[PDB]
Scaffold this active site. Structure first.
Site, PDB file in Angstrom:
ATOM      1  N   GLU B  51       0.645  -1.136  -0.104  1.00 19.35           N
ATOM      2  CA  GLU B  51      -0.031  -0.112   0.117  1.00 19.35           C
ATOM      3  C   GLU B  51       0.894   1.451   0.083  1.00 19.35           C
ATOM      4  O   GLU B  51       0.787   2.118   0.756  1.00 19.35           O
ATOM      5  CB  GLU B  51      -0.889   0.011   1.266  1.00 19.35           C
ATOM      6  N   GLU B 127      -3.841 -10.609  -0.343  1.00 20.43           N
ATOM      7  CA  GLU B 127      -4.798 -10.618   0.669  1.00 20.43           C
ATOM      8  C   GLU B 127      -6.249 -10.987   0.176  1.00 20.43           C
ATOM      9  O   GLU B 127      -6.574 -10.409  -0.882  1.00 20.43           O
ATOM     10  CB  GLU B 127      -4.787  -9.559   1.371  1.00 20.43           C
ATOM     11  N   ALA B 129     -10.237 -12.666   1.550  1.00 16.79           N
ATOM     12  CA  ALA B 129     -11.058 -13.174   2.867  1.00 16.79           C
ATOM     13  C   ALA B 129     -11.001 -12.704   4.482  1.00 16.79           C
ATOM     14  O   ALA B 129     -10.295 -13.191   5.188  1.00 16.79           O
ATOM     15  CB  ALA B 129     -11.050 -14.830   2.885  1.00 16.79           C
ATOM     16  N   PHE B 191     -10.801  -2.457  13.896  1.00 23.20           N
ATOM     17  CA  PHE B 191     -10.172  -2.956  12.731  1.00 23.20           C
ATOM     18  C   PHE B 191      -8.669  -3.555  12.867  1.00 23.20           C
ATOM     19  O   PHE B 191      -8.286  -4.017  11.951  1.00 23.20           O
ATOM     20  CB  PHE B 191     -10.061  -1.556  11.783  1.00 23.20           C
TER      21      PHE B 191
END
Ligand SMILES: OC[C@H]1O[C@@H](O)[C@H](O)[C@@H](O)[C@H]1O
Ligand SMILES: OC[C@H]1O[C@@H](O)[C@H](O)[C@@H](O)[C@H]1O
Ligand SMILES: OC[C@H]1O[C@@H](O)[C@H](O)[C@@H](O)[C@H]1O
Ligand SMILES: [Mg+2]
Ligand SMILES: [Mg+2]
Ligand SMILES: [Mg+2]
Ligand SMILES: [Mg+2]
Ligand SMILES: [Mg+2]
Ligand SMILES: [Mg+2]
Ligand SMILES: [Mg+2]
Ligand SMILES: [Mg+2]
Ligand code: NA
Ligand code: NA
Ligand code: NA
Ligand code: NA
Ligand code: NA
Ligand code: NA
Lengths: 1011, 204, 193
Positions: B51, B127, B129, B191
């Site tokens: 990211e 990544e 699920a 989160f």
């Protein structure tokens, strides 16, 4: 903090790199490229103090001028002012190899300047200082406060001085280190100098400003339509009222324009660049840029509020062109280029590494005048004006990062080390950021002679990502590695392979077809023009024209790096390595130029001009076929001049307009020509003349020529009988022949013509004797030295075989009186320590007309190294003003370097018959000569000769041209045969077999007569 | 093995990774990782980080690894998961049959991704699920696809263990805490708990 | 120098990276992967003190232990000891986005250890220190003399102490910064410690 001994620190507080800015506040000034009040030059008189190490500079200097400092001009290199010596080293570093450390005795240059700043610059906006070139690393203070530091000697370092300045007087203090860790990446083969050697300037930008901009031009398939895309970045106050307007102009006409607010397209999940905008302008039928027709547009980048207030404008010249490699060919605007290039270092014999506009213009004019169309920035980014000049006059440019680590062992030790990736990355990325909008730059290079390391692969990829518009090349590691889009060897020969382990230099024709290879091949360096060189140059051009993927190369190199020194009487003289006490040094290896340091051409320049011609000619009957090698222009400034002459005597001539389209042909049927019955060879010479002056040439400039033999009438006419007969008188020691006012004396002990009298005046100072050697050329010596002989070099082979010291042994000397002449017959053997190297057998026939016919037959032992020449020499008593010959000329020419010469009747002052190469050697030969005239003498035959006031012995014994002294009389060397001079490189034997004197038996004949 | 480079909070995400001035710091995160771990056989693929969008610094670094260690593929999901800086199409949370055609960086159905014009790489999700709380719905859909399509070669579930931290109540009894539980703010609440197992390794 | 607010400075005096080493001086022990006496762990009880910024650390700490310091286990994250709070942010950086700057209030952990080495290590050879993981950046001193600096929270930073070592007791002083320009490249969705 010794930041100069840490490759992890290449700057402190340095501003981002970007393309040339001037922050105009008026758009019309930006469109016209007029000066900007926001960009001031700080060049001029500065204060300077030299110290032996940084530890010696006093603290007081930060705040006050040192009484003992001097006032000097900046920019400058401090060695040019005499503070310390420039060093000339080729490969071996000038400092001990112990990265990242440098010597503790590190010459330090303390520069300072007291200068003015108007309050207006400080009421708003940002004031930065720009140092375009500081070698090699430096710390900067403003008003006694430390500002920052920079490395990379060849790109601009900028610092924001906004917070340091005050209205009125301010003082800069710049501490420049000669040596730093950046020096490990700056080992280019040139004089090692230091200082603030490029411009220093102060630039005011608004707080909300254009911080970068990139211009791209993309085309449709036939180049009839283009889109100009300009990405603009800003720094400062980002608000919705801001806009960018990019406008494109062709002269005073605005061709296109676009305006948009900031905010680029979404690029990822976090959005886009709110601080950038991309304008796209459509342009129909653009005028394309090339080195042949450097058409340019002007792009003006205005940063402004939407309601009309211009904040600032930046701008550039734009050249619409596409550079792409496709199917193995490098194409420019869809056509395959043929690179007539040269490597050019930035060098001035008085100013060192400081470049000036006049010098750069002088260089571009001469380049174009000599049919060059491309230049490689060996081996670093150039002074910024260079690019502007190439964009405007039209030269293709290879822009090269300042990275050379040649002296490391192995050569990729630093380039393969990730710890040096950061320092290298900056040298590549900052160059691209600065020079990416110039149309002249067509190819980026990753540096020079730094092997092949993983850091090159990483950087190759960086540039291919950020700038897809230009191919990237790099020669290191074998010239065809994964870090290059172009096979770009240095000194690969045309036909001959040199299979070195790991990094072989294949024949260029063979290299293109190696299994799996498909890239184009353009030599980054070839034809090393050191001294009397350029032998074999035509071989490269024939290949380039025959093989599509051989697309040329860059000669090494443009200008000798000689420096001016002054003798006791204060007269200037050209110096080379070691002349400043510098040692170790690499002597004359710094002079490899087509032109001398003051820009006078060396003779090799005309050979380059001719082989690089843009028109090719073929002759059939009296029909001339002219083919154009231009890719984009018609021959709209050219006429063909033709002349027919009978051995130098003009018989007819004319002119015809040339109208050939690019890559086209035109047939020219010549007039019923001159058909004389008189003896001699008829010859046709054609020249392309440009009737109109151009930006780079005067009216009447000759751009190309070619010569052919037409009919030949051999002479079958018998000389009239003579009303006389020479008489012979003999003594044990001599044979004397007399005929009227003339006399010849042959020594019976030595077997040579020892004296000749005309009237009653003696003509020779030294007897006429055979000569098998020459004062060695740079190419004959290569890297050989007395402390380190290279036994493979030609000079060493000749020396070891005894050629220089063999002594003539007389084997026979007889005299016979014939019906109408006296005939002298001799034979001599030259031997060395038991071995017979050469046998010379001759006859001298002196007839009743006073002519002396000399026939020479030589044998050369098959096992001795081939000799430099097979000829005679003598020192004439006379010294005459002029030399007149019927043969090739008018400039010096050698067997493997005579294509540019034309056979005609030449007449030059004696001095022109000597070429003043800085490092003296055999020089001034003219080949293909049928008749030579000097004073009362005439010699006829088919020979090569040189004539001057300097003996071959003197030239071989004197290291510098200014130490030569005219001898009494004139030395004449007349050769039946003379070896090639070579030059494919200057460090291994390079004379092609066909130019070596290996025939074993040689025959030549001359007639020496009076008048 | 993945370099310690993540610049998610920049706007746009590649602000630093496309900037040459950040090439040095980024380079050491990749080169030093390779210098340390290149002899481990378990390491089969190198990753340039996470990211951080797609910047030219990624391209440079991808090339550096490919030169220095040709023994392992290099992957990197930033900038759309199928950029010039990855040998494997390696999206995060691309769905099996449903396309999510976001601008610039769409997440195509993985079956569709494989066959886009000109594409030929394998696809392994970096990544998928997201196992946050009561989750894993739809897991079987992935597996059925992976088995049927040769080029769909699997993926890595996000993620192994909940990042909950132990706090103690007035009584000395421990409890699992999440974002904000330590007065940290702003915070992203629960989160941080996306695992297939609780923090003490009890399975969900 | 605030080397922690300069991305061009990611380390000072740090040795090159390399695969795991143990300097075995017996081939059979290297074959068997047994312990090497030339590789010692300094894990265990260290001395530690927390500061609000690097500007608050007293010079004295370089030469002497602070009496107000606590004895803690290393390795550790200091939040786990309760010295400041761990922060859980996903995307948004835990600090103001203004590269390469970080907050003036930057929690600083001052760790120290007193140790000694074998006589033979004083005699010859190279003795380095290896910190497998320090978050996010740090300065190192030995016997009061500055050694170097490192960044990148997830790879080992190594320094040569050969010239710093002395007979008897020696003292390491390690100043660890919570935030640094390295933090701009460490925005992973996890607790910030
Ligand atoms: O005169 C020798 C030449 O040799 C080449 O190998 C080099 O790239 C040039 O810079 C120059 O040194
Ligand atoms: O008349 C002189 C000419 O003689 C021809 O035989 C010869 O080919 C020419 O090169 C030139 O020497
Ligand atoms: O739990 C949300 C996850 O989102 C992904 O996009 C990411 O790469 C993971 O690190 C984690 O943040
Ligand atoms: Mg440095
Ligand atoms: Mg307007
Ligand atoms: Mg005002
Ligand atoms: Mg070199
Ligand atoms: Mg020498
Ligand atoms: Mg929240
Ligand atoms: Mg830093
Ligand atoms: Mg994230
Ligand atoms: Na060609
Ligand atoms: Na040279
Ligand atoms: Na014409
Ligand atoms: Na000489
Ligand atoms: Na599969
Ligand atoms: Na999460």
């Amino acid at each position: 903090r010794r930041d100069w001994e840490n490759p992890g620190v290449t700057q402190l507080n340095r501003l981002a790199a970007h393309p040339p800015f001037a922050s105009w506040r008026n758009s019309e000034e930006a469109r016209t490229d007029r000066p900007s009040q926001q960009l001031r030059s700080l060049n001029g008189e500065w204060r300077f103090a030299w110290f032996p190490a940084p530890e010696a500079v006093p603290e007081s200097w930060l705040e006050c001028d040192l009484p003992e400092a001097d006032t000097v001009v900046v920019p400058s290199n401090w060695q040019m002012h005499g503070y310390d010596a420039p060093i000339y080293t080729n490969v071996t570093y000038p400092i001990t190899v112990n990265p990242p450390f440098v010597p503790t005795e590190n010459p330090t240059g303390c520069y300072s300047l007291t200068f003015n700043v108007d309050e207006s610059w400080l009421q708003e906006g940002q004031t930065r200082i720009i140092f375009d070139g500081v070698n090699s690393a430096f710390h900067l203070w403003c008003n006694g406060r430390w500002v920052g530091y920079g490395q990379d000697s060849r790109l601009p370092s900028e610092f924001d001085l906004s917070a340091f300045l005050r209205a009125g007087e301010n003082r800069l203090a710049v501490m420049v280190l000669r040596w730093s860790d950046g020096s490990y990446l700056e080992d280019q083969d040139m004089w090692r100098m230091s200082g603030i050697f490029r411009d220093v300037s102060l630039l005011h930008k608004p707080t909300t400003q254009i911080s970068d901009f990139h211009v791209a031009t993309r085309f449709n398939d036939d180049f009839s339509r283009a889109v100009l895309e300009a990405e603009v970045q800003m720094c400062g106050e980002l608000r919705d009222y801001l806009r960018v307007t990019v406008s494109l102009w062709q002269g005073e006409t605005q061709v296109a324009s676009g305006t948009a607010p900031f905010g680029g397209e979404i690029i990822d999940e976090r959005g886009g660049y709110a601080d950038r905008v991309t304008l796209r302008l459509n342009v129909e039928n653009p005028k394309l840029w090339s080195a042949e027709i450097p058409n340019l547009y002007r792009a003006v980048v205005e940063l402004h509020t939407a309601d009309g207030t211009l904040i600032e404008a930046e701008a550039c010249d734009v050249g619409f062109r596409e550079v792409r490699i496709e199917n193995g060919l490098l194409l420019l605007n869809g056509k395959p280029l043929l690179i007539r290039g040269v490597n050019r270092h930035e060098h001035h014999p008085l100013h060192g590494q400081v470049m000036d506009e006049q010098t750069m213009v002088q260089d571009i004019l001469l380049m174009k005048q000599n049919n060059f169309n491309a230049v490689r920035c060996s081996h670093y980014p150039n002074h910024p004006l260079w690019y502007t000049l190439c964009d405007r006059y039209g030269l293709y440019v290879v822009d090269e990062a300042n990275i050379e680590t040649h002296g490391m062992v192995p050569m990729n030790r630093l380039t393969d080390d990730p710890r040096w990736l950061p320092a290298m990355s900056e040298r590549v990325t900052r160059m691209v950021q600065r020079d990416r909008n110039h149309p002249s730059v067509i190819i980026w290079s990753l540096g020079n002679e730094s092997g092949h390391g993983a850091n090159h692969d990483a950087l190759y990829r960086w540039i291919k990502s950020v700038d897809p518009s230009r191919p990237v090349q790099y020669e290191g590691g074998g010239a065809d590695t994964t870090a290059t889009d172009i096979i770009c060897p240095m000194y690969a020969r045309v036909d001959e392979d040199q299979p070195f382990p790991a990094v072989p230099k294949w024949s260029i024709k063979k290299w293109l077809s190696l299994p799996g290879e498909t890239r184009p091949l353009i030599l980054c360096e070839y034809a090393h023009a050191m001294g009397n060189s350029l032998g074999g140059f035509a071989k490269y051009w024939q290949a380039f024209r025959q093989y599509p993927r051989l697309q040329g190369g860059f000669v090494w190199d443009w200008v000798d790096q000689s420096l001016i020194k002054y003798d006791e009487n204060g007269n200037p003289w050209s110096a080379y390595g070691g002349d400043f006490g510098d040692t170790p040094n690499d002597r004359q290896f710094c002079m490899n130029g087509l032109v001398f340091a003051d820009r006078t051409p060396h003779p090799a320049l005309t050979e380059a001009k001719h082989q690089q011609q843009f028109f090719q000619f073929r002759l059939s009957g009296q029909t001339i076929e002219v083919t154009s090698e231009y890719l984009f222009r018609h021959s709209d400034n050219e006429l063909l001049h033709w002349m027919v002459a009978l051995d130098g005597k003009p018989l007819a001539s004319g002119e015809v307009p040339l109208d050939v389209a690019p890559q086209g042909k035109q047939l020219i049927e010549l007039p019923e020509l001159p058909q004389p019955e008189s003896a001699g060879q008829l010859w046709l010479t054609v020249r392309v003349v440009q009737p109109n002056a151009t930006a780079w040439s005067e009216a009447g400039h000759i751009s190309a020529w070619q010569q052919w033999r037409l009919a030949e009438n051999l002479s079958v006419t018998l000389p009239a009988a003579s009303h006389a007969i020479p008489h012979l008188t003999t003594s044990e020691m001599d044979f004397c022949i007399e005929l009227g006012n003339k006399r010849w004396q042959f020594n019976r002990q030595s077997g040579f013509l020892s004296q000749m009298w005309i009237g009653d005046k003696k003509q020779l100072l030294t007897p006429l004797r055979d000569q098998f050697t020459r004062a060695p050329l740079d190419n004959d010596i290569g890297v050989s030295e007395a402390t380190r002989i290279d036994p493979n070099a030609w000079v060493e082979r000749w020396k070891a075989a005894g050629h220089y010291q063999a002594e003539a042994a007389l084997l026979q000397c007889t005299a016979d009186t014939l019906a109408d002449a006296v005939l002298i017959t001799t034979a001599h053997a030259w031997q060395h320590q038991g071995k017979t190297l050469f046998i010379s057998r001759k006859t001298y026939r002196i007839d009743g007309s006073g002519q002396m016919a000399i026939t020479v037959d030589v044998e050369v032992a098959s096992d001795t190294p081939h000799p430099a020449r097979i000829g005679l020499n003598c020192q004439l008593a006379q010294v005459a003003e002029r030399v007149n010959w019927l043969g090739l000329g008018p400039q010096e020419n050698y067997p493997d370097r005579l294509t540019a010469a034309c056979f005609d009747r030449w007449d030059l002052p004696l001095s022109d018959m000597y070429t003043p190469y800085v490092f003296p050697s055999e020089n001034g030969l003219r080949c293909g000569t049928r008749e030579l005239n000097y004073g009362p003498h005439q010699w006829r035959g088919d020979f090569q000769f040189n004539i001057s006031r300097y003996s071959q012995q003197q030239l071989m014994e004197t290291s510098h041209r200014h130490l030569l002294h005219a001898e009494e009389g004139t030395w004449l060397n007349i050769d039946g045969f003379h070896m090639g001079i070579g030059g494919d490189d200057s460090w291994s034997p390079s004379v092609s077999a066909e130019f070596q004197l290996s025939a074993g038996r040689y025959h030549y004949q001359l007639v020496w007569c009076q008048k």
